[PDB]
RNA sequence: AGCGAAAUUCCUAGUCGGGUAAAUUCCGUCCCGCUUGAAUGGUGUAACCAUCUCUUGACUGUCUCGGCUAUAGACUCGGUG
RNA sequence: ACCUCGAUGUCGACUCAUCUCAUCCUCGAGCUGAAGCAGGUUCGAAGGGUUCGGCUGUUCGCCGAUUAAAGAGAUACGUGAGUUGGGUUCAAACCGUCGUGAGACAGGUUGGUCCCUAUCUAUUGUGCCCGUAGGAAGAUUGAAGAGUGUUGCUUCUAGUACGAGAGGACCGAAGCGAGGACACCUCUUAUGCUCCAGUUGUAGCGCCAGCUGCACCGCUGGGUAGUAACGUGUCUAUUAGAUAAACGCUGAAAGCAUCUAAGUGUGAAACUAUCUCAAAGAUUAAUCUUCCCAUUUCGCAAGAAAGUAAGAGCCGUCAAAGACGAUGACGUUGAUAGGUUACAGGUGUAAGCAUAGUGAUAUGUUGAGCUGAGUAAUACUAAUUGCUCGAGGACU
């Protein structure tokens, strides 16, 4: 169904301002640069186990 | 489990052939049937080879249900045959011999000569 | 009445043949012995309660404030502690066993978690009725249930507060009373209790005195003939 | 539900698992979604445990979950794996392969994971 | 409980504002005799 | 605390018979049942075969189907119940456990047994 | 003449019988026939009607008495929207 | 005719019921041309329930079957943004009738379509911010509450009293109960869709055998865990305060007396204490507790820099949990999930070898084949040495 009026800016912001983003995990690399997410492979290959991957 | 409206035979020499369950006596919402219980029935087929005629509403006793039930003593009695009996408000029905098995639940309510007369007592 | 009891956890459930060789639904429960942390007596803490400690763990995985309080009370290291209000007090630090707490035939109450059903409808969370779907089904037959005490300008035109609606069901501890004590065992803090236990898997049960009566003990045990032939 | 993407039932699930295990055995490593990667790794561990013991019965049992791929025919796959991969991991109890988290793909922007083996 | 009865009476004799409920908060009436503001030297009066 | 969950054997030992002749789905067996009515000690004899046998130690139950003068009656007993006197009669060729086609067949069509 | 409460009849829940445990179903018997009527046919007729019912067999998740799973979304993620 | 004729879904059935008593039973009591049984009359009082099959466009209306009873009134004549459309009142047509006739009967019938992706008040659960006032967290209290407070049968006591005679009581206890709230899949049933055995056709794999896809997850039989019932397991309370009907004892008014005007017990399924738990943002922000450090000092006591250790969040192994959040543990200080291993269970002698059978087939092989989730030890894999904020008691 629908009402007989419109929804102003304030109602939307009360809906939108609580849709705001949040923070994330982080992982400083202990052997290289290219700071990466936690529990994620750094973007320069050399990972803890080994260079499980590449830089690109 | 054993809901009503299930035509079944008899267990003694009464002349009747078929009979159906109609209603639960006293408190409603029972919705099911158990062995050795008195329930009001509506006869479905009764040829004049005995005394029962079609169109009679009385309380018959069912003793066999193919679905079976769990007796709380630790005996899961499940039958494979269906029959009932009609008692004249005492320990003896109209038939001379009692055919078919009979449960022992109907013991503290009396009716032991029927057990001694029926083919099987379980 | 006098309040005593112990904790417990579900370690299984099966059938047990008690006296008269009849089957009884018996649940085996590992009771957790409680080491008393003291008594919060009234006129001293205003709510009488026997402080029980539980979940015995090691030291290196302990929290500094909880560890400091535990050492200040000098109570032996257990991970968690809780009070039981109006429970008969005991000395700080002792052996609590259901064999000495109660008799083998008393009446007790239990408190066990339930299953998490996730989001669940009324018919499975409040057990309402579902009508026939024959002679045409079409639209959803089970969404919320139709109520009309409000219609027009002023009859109610709104729903009363507390109308059971959308939400999660289960995953909540339920307290049941008047359950018999069945069997005494102390090999591995095991007990036997009649009935069906609340909890889908690995439920935790709080057991205290039943509040309909202190629990009249009656002689019931197990009967069996372990024979070789 | 009428005409649409028809089905993603467990039949397609196990079919995709078979395709992915065939691929990873054909290339020693595969990069896919972690959710599918873990189910693939379970099936891979079961296959490896089956391939530890070798016999015509064991070969028949192994030949129920593999298909022909490029750069490695099904017979070539079986030959290569039973020659080197199975004896190599026959000393480590459990935890055969290693699964590691990758970045998001460009298409769906969904998480990928790399499964590595043949040490 | 009888102090809450006086609370209800005075709240029914006050003009309905935020100041009214704050005045309600500014009243410490209890059935007992042991309280805390008696240490602040409360000037005894009656019907003010 | 970690529990081995082997307490099932511990609760069995307080309800176990020491001989307990076992059976599989497809073996005929007669069961003697002593009943203490205090006036007529009926040794109930239930003959037939076990249709399904539940295991897992203490939950061991089994349904036996008797045909008393053409009256088929299938009754589910339990292994650990007291007063149970199972006497093994003969053992047959166990084709498939949980025999469901034996709950619908009758005499003159039974399976072979071993003396 | 015929048929006559029916799709037609107001007195109706038409009399009565059958069946139905139980008939505001139906079919037969008398004939509440303002408005019974003979080619806007009076009676019925073999076969048939995606014709209208009435009863049963067999049968079932329609009820008793609802539960599991799968797809499809609803939930999240990314793109339009 | 006051607006809703610049749209009022306004029946029945189903679900949910709720509200009131003029409660019907049910509770108790008084009166009674009321021996008992069995009644009637009057009174207060709602805790639960107040049945079912059938026909009917129908709850109606009626028939029949049950209890101590089968209630009444209400919600645009409860419930079409909840459902159907069962139909007077469509269009199509018929029956009988009427109208000269288009058509109609305040008559019946054949057949027939009643939408909505929720903006908000309302409603229910879950989440982030901070208050909460030194922070953080455990135990809690409890201000206000909710759920629930239902009912019968039989026997012993008793064929006892009762009239005399048939007949035959309330209640003390007991069991039997119904019905529902609740528990789980413990045994029975159901389920089990990556679980297997039997199992045909095509397609392939040089071929038999054997494997796989599809052919209803080709199908039938089952079953691990979970999840339900058709399964059995707790309860149907007691107590107290004031109690209604309803008697009181004393006693005046009004020199006897009299529940009442003073004082004084009783007594209803009614109300609340009492049972089940939620329940301080309960701004009435409630209590205790421990840890944190007080590591200087321009400025408004530790940000002008040292900025918790109390923790808290992110991430992951995960799982009672599970839309996300949150939920609980674990995170290299290492057993938190998966396994590795052995076991339960079945799937019930796998393949294959050997023997006899032309062949099907008959025996050791061998409980063999394996196990989604079942039982337990398990660095073997994954859980990063990872990121962020985070104190000086802020003021009496």
UniProtKB/Swiss-Prot annotation, chain A:
InterPro entries tied to this protein: Ribosomal_bL32, Ribosomal_bL32_bact, Ribosomal_zn-bd
Segments for region (Disordered): 1-20
Gene Ontology terms, MF aspect: structural constituent of ribosome
Compositionally biased region (Basic residues): 6-17
Record-level GO cellular component terms: large ribosomal subunit
Domain of life: Bacteria
Keyword annotations: Ribonucleoprotein, Ribosomal protein
Any one biological process term the GO annotation gives: translation
Keyword Zinc set for record: no
Pfam families: Ribosomal_L32p (PF01783)
Stored HAMAP family: Ribosomal_bL32 (MF_00340)
Family: Belongs to the bacterial ribosomal protein bL32 family.
Protein name, entry field: Large ribosomal subunit protein bL32
Taxonomic source organism: Mycoplasma pneumoniae (strain ATCC 29342 / M129 / Subtype 1)
Lineage per the UniProt record: Bacteria, Bacillati, Mycoplasmatota, Mycoplasmoidales, Mycoplasmoidaceae
From Swiss-Prot, chain B:
The keyword rRNA-binding is annotated on this UniProt entry: yes
One Pfam family linked to the record: Ribosomal_L14
GO biological process: translation
Keywords noted in UniProt: Ribonucleoprotein, Ribosomal protein, RNA-binding, rRNA-binding
InterPro entries: Ribosomal_uL14, Ribosomal_uL14_bac-type, Ribosomal_uL14_CS, Ribosomal_uL14_sf
GO cellular component, one term: cytosolic large ribosomal subunit
GO function terms (MF aspect): large ribosomal subunit rRNA binding; structural constituent of ribosome
Similarity field: Belongs to the universal ribosomal protein uL14 family.
Biological role stated in the UniProt entry: Binds to 23S rRNA. Forms part of two intersubunit bridges in the 70S ribosome.
Subunit structure: Part of the 50S ribosomal subunit. Forms a cluster with proteins L3 and L19. In the 70S ribosome, L14 and L19 interact and together make contacts with the 16S rRNA in bridges B5 and B8.
Family annotation (NCBIfam families): rplN_bact
Name this polypeptide is given: Large ribosomal subunit protein uL14
Record organism: Mycoplasma pneumoniae (strain ATCC 29342 / M129 / Subtype 1)
Species classification: Bacteria, Bacillati, Mycoplasmatota, Mycoplasmoidales, Mycoplasmoidaceae
Curated annotation (Swiss-Prot), chain E:
Domain of life: Bacteria
Family: Belongs to the universal ribosomal protein uL13 family.
Subunit comment: Part of the 50S ribosomal subunit.
Function: This protein is one of the early assembly proteins of the 50S ribosomal subunit, although it is not seen to bind rRNA by itself. It is important during the early stages of 50S assembly.
Name by which UniProt lists this protein: Large ribosomal subunit protein uL13
Curated annotation (Swiss-Prot), chain F:
InterPro entries in UniProt: Ribosomal_bL19, Ribosomal_bL19_CS, Ribosomal_bL19_sf, Translation_prot_SH3-like_sf
Free-text function comment from the UniProt entry: This protein is located at the 30S-50S ribosomal subunit interface and may play a role in the structure and function of the aminoacyl-tRNA binding site.
Ranges annotated as spanning the membrane: none
Gene Ontology biological process terms, A to Z: translation
Molecular function as annotated in GO: structural constituent of ribosome
One CC-aspect GO term: cytosolic large ribosomal subunit
Family: Belongs to the bacterial ribosomal protein bL19 family.
Name this protein carries in UniProt: Large ribosomal subunit protein bL19
Source organism per UniProt: Mycoplasma pneumoniae (strain ATCC 29342 / M129 / Subtype 1) (Mycoplasmoides pneumoniae)
Keywords: Ribonucleoprotein, Ribosomal protein
